[PDB]
Design a protein around this ligand. Sequence first.
Ligand SMILES: O=c1[nH]cnc2c1ncn2[C@@H]1O[C@H](CO)[C@@H](O)[C@H]1O
Ligand SMILES: O=c1[nH]cnc2c1ncn2[C@@H]1O[C@H](CO)[C@@H](O)[C@H]1O
Ligand SMILES: O=c1[nH]cnc2c1ncn2[C@@H]1O[C@H](CO)[C@@H](O)[C@H]1O
Ligand SMILES: O=c1[nH]cnc2c1ncn2[C@@H]1O[C@H](CO)[C@@H](O)[C@H]1O
Ligand SMILES: [Ca+2]
Ligand SMILES: [Ca+2]
Ligand code: NI
Lengths: 314, 317
Amino acid sequence: AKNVVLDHAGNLDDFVAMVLLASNTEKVRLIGALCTDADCFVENGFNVTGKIMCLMHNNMNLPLFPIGKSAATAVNPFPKEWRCLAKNMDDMPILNIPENVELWDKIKAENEKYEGQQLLADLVMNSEEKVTICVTGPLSNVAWCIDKYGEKFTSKVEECVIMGGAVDVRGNVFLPSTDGTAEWNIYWDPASAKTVFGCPGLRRIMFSLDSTNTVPVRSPYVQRFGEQTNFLLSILVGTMWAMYYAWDALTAAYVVDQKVANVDPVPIDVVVDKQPNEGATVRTDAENYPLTFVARNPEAEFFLDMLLRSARAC
Amino acid sequence: SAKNVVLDHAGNLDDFVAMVLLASNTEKVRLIGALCTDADCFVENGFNVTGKIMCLMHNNMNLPLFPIGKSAATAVNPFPKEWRCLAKNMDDMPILNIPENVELWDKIKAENEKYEGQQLLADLVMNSEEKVTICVTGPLSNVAWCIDKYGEKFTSKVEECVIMGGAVDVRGNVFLPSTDGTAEWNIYWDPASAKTVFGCPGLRRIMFSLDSTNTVPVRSPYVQRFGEQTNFLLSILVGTMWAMCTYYAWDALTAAYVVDQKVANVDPVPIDVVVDKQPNEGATVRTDAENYPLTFVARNPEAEFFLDMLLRSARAC
Ligand SMILES: O=c1[nH]cnc2c1ncn2[C@@H]1O[C@H](CO)[C@@H](O)[C@H]1O
Ligand SMILES: O=c1[nH]cnc2c1ncn2[C@@H]1O[C@H](CO)[C@@H](O)[C@H]1O
Ligand SMILES: O=c1[nH]cnc2c1ncn2[C@@H]1O[C@H](CO)[C@@H](O)[C@H]1O
Ligand SMILES: O=c1[nH]cnc2c1ncn2[C@@H]1O[C@H](CO)[C@@H](O)[C@H]1O
Ligand SMILES: [Ca+2]
Ligand SMILES: [Ca+2]
Ligand code: NI
């Protein structure tokens, strides 16, 4: 298996992505996770990450791993409308079985002392083999590592698989001050995203809205987790999807198996100016600008089957 | 021993916790029917979630099946709502989509699709051998329709109506640019129907207004205790519903009273409803009209008793 670190923002799909990575131990060795106070209040996101990890560790062969809270702060905050979703998951019955919460209470102190950004840097730089970073939240943490360590960090990254942006499709950030061209993860911290997408020597796979828009969350599919209620992960995943696109989950599925999508190189820049299109990921013709491999035409059925099967790991 | 009960609800998360409380306490309650109104949910979703809960309960605790109808009631004041979706999410929850339960619901869904909720309530009440208790957790439109159509022929068959709604000596929860914050949502949705119900003589009414429901909030550590009971389908269900709206136990408290009146003492108050288009439209006010019908308003509910009742009830299966 290959080493993977999950850098997420604590929304429901970030957690479905976590389940996908953690459950596929033959292909992925999940060596760490960091949570950013973005799509969630870092507090609850950290706790849900820990509760899911402990539920899996006590039920399948998933080694414990470090979990760190990132110190990253937003340039433009997510809608408070969907930030406290990690708070709700923190209270779900399936994540509060006493034997699992007891394990989390026993290992929480070791994890509370990590600073997420430094943890991402250390896990990547100190690994024997290269590490794949699955980024389902903003790019603030990867940018921080690039700024502090440069090539000492990027040379140890196998690839960075990123959920974010919108290249040849409309974005999803519709506010009185914006024009709808930007996507939320990039809009949260444009400058950090600029740093990541313009870094030479860093291989980037980009799951922008171009690909995620083609694999929507539909009721008949979500109801199939009801056929697997003897599996804790199916009660977990079905409950989170029961609450609009499998953005982060698609991104993580690619990490598990690249047959999820073909990718095409595009030089991607980011608008960091305080304008209506702030956060937009745009094609640039600047000479020698670094290429990003944008996912295209994802294999929907393959992904949907992968998630249902993965949710039977325990 | 058990008494006949009909649940008249609006499909939000607490309407469903109320349903589980009534249905799980078979020593005390015989649930003979339910109707769903297109108020705090899109009614088709509320209809399906009611059916799916009933079928899970029939297959796991022998709950007898009963008719479920969608009401044709339309709002006087619709919510400018972004929360009428907590029935849709629910319809897709894994614990309500177990094959053996979905198969049974699919088998009986067409028969229930044919009912019209308002007429169904009237028929359930009027054709019953023993009197019927109506637990109303959504707006009062359906009870009002029955009173308007059948009058005493309907009310004489009602044991009592236990209603969640209103605010008597505390502020309300309807905060809009044109309101003064003294009205509560179930009444504000259809004030005229509420006025009809509260002013009907010869109808016994118990009222769980914000005065009592404000005293029992949904708190995270208590909700997390349902995780100690995941071997019970109803604990995964109730816990999941209270988890996503950690909010008060408005409807659940109302249903708990139907199960055991020790949940709260009640005090008689003559209640009128503001129907004119004023800032306090929908408010429940104490009227001084001579000989006006009394409503028994719940006071100082037994919170610990209620919280224990719900955790216990959720171990029924
Ligand atoms: O409406 C929403 N609800 C929950 N999460 C959302 C929503 N919109 C965006 N994201 C979050 O931002 C990225 C996609 O733009 C994904 O990483 C997702 O977690
Ligand atoms: O009466 C009905 N019978 C069968 N399905 C129905 C009915 N009403 C709504 N649906 C809905 O249409 C799809 C199934 O054809 C499902 O989405 C179901 O929720
Ligand atoms: O008690 C109250 N609390 C909060 N807002 C209120 C209350 N009463 C009336 N409004 C009104 O509803 C809008 C905010 O939702 C404001 O326009 C305010 O005038
Ligand atoms: O903020 C809210 N979210 C969801 N349901 C609500 C909210 N406020 C009120 N109710 C609904 O209206 C009655 C209490 O006024 C209860 O019947 C409850 O189901
Ligand atoms: Ca995310
Ligand atoms: Ca209600
Ligand atoms: Ni239908």
